[PDB]
Amino acid sequence: SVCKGVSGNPAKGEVFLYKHVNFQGDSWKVTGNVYDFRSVSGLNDVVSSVKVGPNTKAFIFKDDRFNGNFIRLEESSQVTDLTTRNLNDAISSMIVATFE
Amino acid sequence: SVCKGVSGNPAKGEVFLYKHVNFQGDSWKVTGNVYDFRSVSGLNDVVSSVKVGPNTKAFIFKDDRFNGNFIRLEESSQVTDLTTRNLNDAISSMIVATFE
Amino acid sequence: SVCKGVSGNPAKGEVFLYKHVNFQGDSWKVTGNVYDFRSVSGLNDVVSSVKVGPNTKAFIFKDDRFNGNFIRLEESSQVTDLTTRNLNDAISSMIVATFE
Amino acid sequence: SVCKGVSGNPAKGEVFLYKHVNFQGDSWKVTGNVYDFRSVSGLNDVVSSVKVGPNTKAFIFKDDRFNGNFIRLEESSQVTDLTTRNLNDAISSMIVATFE
Ligand SMILES: [Ca+2]
Ligand SMILES: [Ca+2]
Ligand SMILES: [Ca+2]
Ligand SMILES: [Ca+2]
Ligand SMILES: [Ca+2]
Ligand SMILES: [Ca+2]
Ligand SMILES: [Ca+2]
Ligand SMILES: [Ca+2]
């Protein structure tokens, strides 16, 4: 599921999405998969920075239903500015997978 | 999970993995994610053909834990020979995601 | 996951945990399962009241990893004081399951 | 999900259900939750023995949607004859939860 407003760093199976770069602005904690960011009010196409928890891989897609351009985010990683990966204010679906 | 031996075509959320090209040889039905094909005896590095069910996306990785080269497989699709995608006898992890 | 601070009543698949009886004090919205309330700062052994959403069952355990005494909570239910079920300030794990 | 026909012992997150005691007869491998055993042809009310994988807890209910009498099954455990727990040929729903 998704939760509004985060703090600190993501735990295993969690992904922190921030509206502004450098982890600022509105934030959301996500676990599991979300095939349509529109199901979350104001989430679609506004994410600018991301944090991925340990033993966790994240896949962010430009379009809903895991379509369009996308990239893989490694465990315990973070991107302060999605523009650097050509996905600023454009993500519309995401996969959150974990492992041992 | 992973289950040995398949027949017909995959249903939503199912992916059929075959040891030989053209959907022949030992087979496996997979749902959800599998971060290490090593967890299933004889599954690692032997897949040659694939079938993905409707409303389903499949992401196959060369290494375990979703690392290494990979590709996205579209719903209701199939590849008779994975050499065509540079992934014959090399898949070691996979993510199966669905949507409505 | 677990998310701090709740309001209103839980929706399907959500369980609201309150630190004080009568749904007062620090609160948490939980979905899915949590095998160790220790993973959430200040959550372990402090729950005093609960609310379970529609089409949802909740299983609260005295110990972590679903061990020790426990009880089943019915959909759309609430307990204003967990002492009534011998589980005040003692829950350490919980399973949240839904059905149609 | 559920899969027909098992062998060996359950891995983490898996539960093996057998139609006859002592792990004989038709068998099914289950992961995740199943709120209505009737969704699986011939599964409802026929289970006589069970095996639960490591770091895994299972909850078997007499009625669907996790209602009626039920018991908890510990990780790496197994019951050769469910009559001993007063649930022979009666299980109709189940929860499969894992932990680290
Ligand atoms: Ca933005
Ligand atoms: Ca988009
Ligand atoms: Ca092969
Ligand atoms: Ca490989
Ligand atoms: Ca309390
Ligand atoms: Ca406790
Ligand atoms: Ca039987
Ligand atoms: Ca029954």
UniProtKB/Swiss-Prot annotation, chains A, B, C, D:
InterPro entries recorded: Beta/gamma_crystallin (IPR001064), Ca_cell_adhesion_N_dom (IPR015059), G_crystallin-like (IPR011024)
Compartments in which it is found: Cytoplasm
UniProt function note: Structural protein.
GO cellular component assignments: cytoplasm; membrane
Matching SMART domains: XTALbg
Pfam families from the UniProt entry: Crystall_3
Residue span(s) of domain Beta/gamma crystallin 'Greek key': 13-54, 56-98
Major localization listed first in the record, in broad terms: cytoplasm
Taxonomic source organism: Physarum polycephalum (Slime mold)
Family: Belongs to the beta/gamma-crystallin family.
The protein's name: Spherulin-3A
UniProt-annotated stretches for the region N-terminal arm: 1-12
